[PDB]
Design a protein around this nucleic acid. Structure first.
Lengths: 162, 94
RNA sequence: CCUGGUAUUGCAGUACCUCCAGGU
């Protein structure tokens, strides 16, 4: 069940609860993110929850995409050119995925508008200094794992890793 | 209070602006199923609370058990099944 | 809107939403 143009065209399309245009791509068992061209850059949000995607990569240039819900997939790596295809990405929800090393979260530093980030229920979470590492390497984030990035944490992350 | 499509949350940090609260609520609760809508006001009466509505009932029950006391913006949230059925649910059913 | 501090534990359908001081 390839993510195909035909698949996207019959997919529930609606205005979500936070007033954004969202496309519903839940529970299709998609393994690879591809063929997004067919959405025609018409969505503010794309819901990819409960699928089998391994890597957050493969996006076309999508100027309107601001929210990516990627819950319960198998994300173990993040693509390197994400800001070049998603310039205004502001919210990224990665709860319950497979990111294991702090260094695998490095590609998120290039998403200049990224403000809401959630990486809960990922092995990487239990790594020593996981929170400070994210704060220093992705300073554009204001809310991390539903907790406010505070000044004291920023300073503390400036010492360690300076 | 029987299982319900809508969950009632209280004990929330009322300093978060309304639109940010609703967007984080949506994000957090999307992991269990499609959230149809969220009702949250900052009036004196309703501040620190929110109603989260899900398409599927199993999603509401799972959310309730798994996020009971989850630290959200600094406080442990308290979740419960809503007393009544949500207007949106009643309209979607009949 | 942003810092501090402070009140409120309340079952809803929303112009907006505690108050106090400081910053814009």
């Amino acid at each position: 069940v390839k993510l195909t143009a035909e698949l996207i065209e019959q997919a529930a399309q609606y205005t979500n609860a936070v007033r954004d245009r969202e496309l519903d791509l839940r529970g299709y068992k998609i393994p690879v993110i591809e063929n997004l061209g067919a959405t025609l850059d018409q969505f503010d949000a794309i819901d990819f929850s409960d699928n089998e995607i391994r890597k957050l990569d493969g996006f076309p240039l999508l100027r309107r995409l601001k929210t990516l819900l990627v819950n319960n997939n198998r994300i173990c790596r993040i693509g390197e050119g994400l800001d070049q295809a998603l310039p205004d990405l502001t919210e990224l929800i990665l709860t319950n995925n497979s990111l294991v090393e702090l260094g695998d979260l490095d590609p998120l530093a290039s998403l200049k508008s990224l403000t809401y980030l959630c990486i809960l229920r990922n092995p990487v979470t239990n790594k020593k200094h996981y929170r400070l590492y994210v704060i220093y390497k992705v300073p554009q984030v204001r809310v991390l794992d539903f907790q406010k990035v505070k000044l004291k944490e920023r300073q503390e992350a400036e010492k360690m890793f300076k | 209070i029987r299982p319900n499509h809508t969950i009632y949350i209280n004990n929330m940090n009322d300093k978060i602006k309304k639109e940010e609260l609703k967007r984080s609520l949506y994000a957090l609760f999307s992991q269990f199923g499609h959230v149809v809508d969220i009702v949250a006001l900052k009036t004196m009466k309703m501040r620190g609370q929110a109603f989260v509505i899900f398409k599927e009932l199993g999603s509401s029950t799972n959310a309730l058990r798994q996020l009971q006391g989850f630290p959200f913006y600094g406080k442990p949230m308290r979740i419960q099944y809503a007393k009544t059925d949500s207007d949106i649910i009643s309209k979607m059913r009949g």
